[PDB]
From Swiss-Prot:
Effect of substituting residue 27 to A: Loss of RNase activity
Cell compartment(s), UniProt: Virion; Host cytoplasm
Site (Important for exonuclease activity): 104
Name under which the protein is recorded: Nucleoprotein
Domain notes: The N-terminal region is important for the cap-binding activity while the C-terminal region contains the 3'-5' exoribonuclease activity. A CCHE zinc binding site is present in the C-terminal region and may thus contribute to the substrate binding and/or the specificity of the exonuclease activity.
Subunit details: Homomultimerizes to form the nucleocapsid. Binds to viral genomic RNA. Interacts with glycoprotein G2. Interacts with protein Z; this interaction probably directs the encapsidated genome to budding sites. Interacts with protein L; this interaction does not interfere with Z-L interaction. Interacts with host IKBKE (via Protein kinase domain); the interaction inhibits IKBKE kinase activity.
Organism per entry: Lassa virus (strain Mouse/Sierra Leone/Josiah/1976) (LASV)
Length: 207
């Protein structure tokens, strides 16, 4: 039980908001065979696709949560099943996608039968990739609250050290800002409706 026919048609029309000739970044959290967060981003217009997926392998998810995304698995229980395959299905033919480390992105697209999509492998160094990390999280903190856990990294002299969690959306933004040499001035806008990315949406708080 994935997307209904009405959801698929809404997704198809929403994909027209993407400029197939403009630069499109993409990044994922989790392994390509079991992703939990997916983001596509067109900095020219600010349009972005952002959604989540419940993991199949809970054991590997715990490790990815500790060393990468810090997502609580219980926050993914209300995600829309089949949305990953549906979004990749609706991507324009022969689309060019930019990403930092295209290997895992390629495996994901190929598993969905999308070998027509051309990938541009950006190879930013570790220090260059995070040069705008603090600024992007500060400006776009409201766009993703899914990274609640403490993410750690091993240091060569013993013990762990907390790092900023990795977000597939903040990655697209901060990597594009590093390559562009400055943060984009466009106002970001979600392509996917909110009732499509989550099956149950919490209503706005009445104060
Ligand atoms: Mg990546
Ligand atoms: Zn995120």
């Amino acid at each position: 039980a994935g997307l209904t026919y009405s959801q698929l048609m809404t997704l198809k029309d929403a994909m027209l908001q993407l400029d197939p000739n403009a630069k499109t970044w993409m990044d994922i959290e989790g392994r390509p065979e079991d992703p939990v967060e997916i983001a596509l981003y067109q900095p020219s217009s600010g349009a972005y696709i952002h959604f989540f997926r419940e993991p199949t392998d809970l054991k590997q998810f715990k490790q990815d949560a500790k060393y990468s995304h810090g997502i609580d698995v219980t926050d993914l229980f209300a995600t829309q099943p089949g949305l990953t395959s549906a979004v990749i299905d609706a991507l324009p033919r022969n689309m060019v996608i930019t990403c930092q480390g295209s290997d895992d992105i390629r495996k994901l697209l190929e598993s969905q039968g999308r070998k027509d999509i051309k990938l541009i492998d950006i190879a930013l160094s570790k220090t260059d990739s995070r040069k705008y990390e603090n600024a992007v999280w500060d400006q776009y903190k409201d766009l993703c609250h899914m990274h609640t856990g403490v993410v750690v990294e091993k240091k060569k002299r013993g013990g762990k050290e907390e790092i900023t969690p990795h977000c597939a959306l903040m990655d697209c933004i901060m990597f594009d800002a590093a390559v562009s040499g400055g943060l984009n001035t466009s106002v970001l806008r979600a392509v996917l409706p909110r009732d499509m990315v989550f099956r149950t949406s919490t209503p706005r708080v009445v104060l």
